[PDB]
C-alpha cells in the first residue's frame, strides 16, 4: 500500500533518513497510524483542569474547575453552575420564575408538570427546586 501506513500510534512519518516511524515529540500525540506529523496536546489552563494526562497515543482530556461544569463535546468550554432552584441568566444565577423549577446545578428552569392535562389530581405542589407530584385520577 504505502510504507508509512503500519506506522503505529505514537509515531509519525519521518523522511530525514533511516526511521520510517519515529516517535512523537513531547507534548504531542498521534492516535492514528501513518500520520504525517503528531498533533500538539491540548493544554488545560485557567478554568479548565487536566483530567487525563497527555500521551503519545491519546490526547489529554480537560476537566472543568469545581464551580463549573463541562459543556459541548470533549469539554470544549466551561459554564458556571448555579444551585438547584436557579438557572444561569445573562447577569448570573437567578432564582426560577414562579411556576418553573430546576433540580440541577446546571440547566434552565423548566415549568412544573400540569397534572390535569394528564388526567391526574396533584399529590404534592412544586417548589423552585422540585417538580409537582401528580396523584391519582379524580372521582
Amino acid at each position: 500500500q504505502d510504507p508509512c501506513s503500519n506506522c503505529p500510534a505514537g509515531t509519525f512519518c519521518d523522511n530525514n533518513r533511516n526511521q520510517i516511524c519515529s516517535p512523537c515529540p513531547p507534548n504531542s500525540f498521534s492516535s492514528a497510524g501513518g500520520q504525517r506529523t503528531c498533533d500538539i496536546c491540548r493544554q488545560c489552563k485557567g478554568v479548565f483542569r487536566t483530567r487525563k494526562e497527555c500521551s503519545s497515543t491519546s490526547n489529554a482530556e480537560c476537566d472543568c474547575t469545581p464551580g463549573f461544569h463541562c459543556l459541548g463535546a470533549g469539554c470544549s468550554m466551561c459554564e458556571q453552575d448555579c444551585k438547584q432552584g436557579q438557572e444561569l441568566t445573562k447577569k448570573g444565577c437567578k432564582d426560577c420564575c414562579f411556576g418553573t423549577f430546576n433540580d440541577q446545578k446546571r440547566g434552565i428552569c423548566r415549568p412544573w408538570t400540569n397534572c390535569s392535562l394528564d388526567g391526574k389530581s396533584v399529590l404534592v405542589n412544586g417548589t423552585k427546586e422540585r417538580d409537582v407530584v401528580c396523584g391519582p385520577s379524580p372521582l
Partner: nanobody, 125 residues
Framework: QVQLVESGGGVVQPGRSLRLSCAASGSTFSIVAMGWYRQAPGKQRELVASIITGDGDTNYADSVKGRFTISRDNSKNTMYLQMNSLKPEDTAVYYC??????????????????WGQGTQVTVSS
C-alpha cells in the same frame, strides 16, 4: 412491587388523638412521595396530607392544617399521620397512597401508584 398496610384505626370521642401508620414492603426505593386519602360515605375522596420521602416537605389540606401531622421514618420504612383534635367530620376511611415518580412519570419496572386496604376512623361520643 410495593405493598402498603394500614394500622391504628379505631373509635374515639371528639378531641382525642389517633395515629395512623402505613407500612411499605418490597420495592420501597421506588417510592418518591406518599399521602393519606379519606373517603366518607356520600362525599368524595379528599386528599388529607402528602409528603416527599426524600426531602420531607409536606402538603396538608386546609381542613386539617394545624391538627394533623404527616411524618416519615425511613429506618422502619413507614409513614405516620398523627391526628389530634378529631372532629365528627374526620370520620371516614383512611387510605394510604404511594407514588413512584415526579409529575405523571413512574419508575420503569414498577406501578405508577399503590394503595393500602384502608383503615376506618370513627369519631362519635
Amino acid at each position: 412491587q410495593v405493598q402498603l398496610v394500614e394500622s391504628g384505626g379505631g373509635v374515639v370521642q371528639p378531641g382525642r388523638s389517633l395515629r395512623l401508620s402505613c407500612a411499605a414492603s418490597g420495592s420501597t426505593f421506588s417510592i418518591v412521595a406518599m399521602g393519606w386519602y379519606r373517603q366518607a360515605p356520600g362525599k368524595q375522596r379528599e386528599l388529607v396530607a402528602s409528603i416527599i420521602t426524600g426531602d420531607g416537605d409536606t402538603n396538608y389540606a386546609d381542613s386539617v392544617k394545624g391538627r394533623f401531622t404527616i411524618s416519615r421514618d425511613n429506618s422502619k420504612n413507614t409513614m405516620y399521620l398523627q391526628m389530634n383534635s378529631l372532629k365528627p367530620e374526620d370520620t371516614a376511611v383512611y387510605y394510604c397512597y404511594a407514588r413512584t415518580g415526579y409529575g405523571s412519570s413512574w419508575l420503569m419496572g414498577h406501578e405508577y401508584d399503590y394503595w393500602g386496604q384502608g383503615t376506618q376512623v370513627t369519631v362519635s361520643s
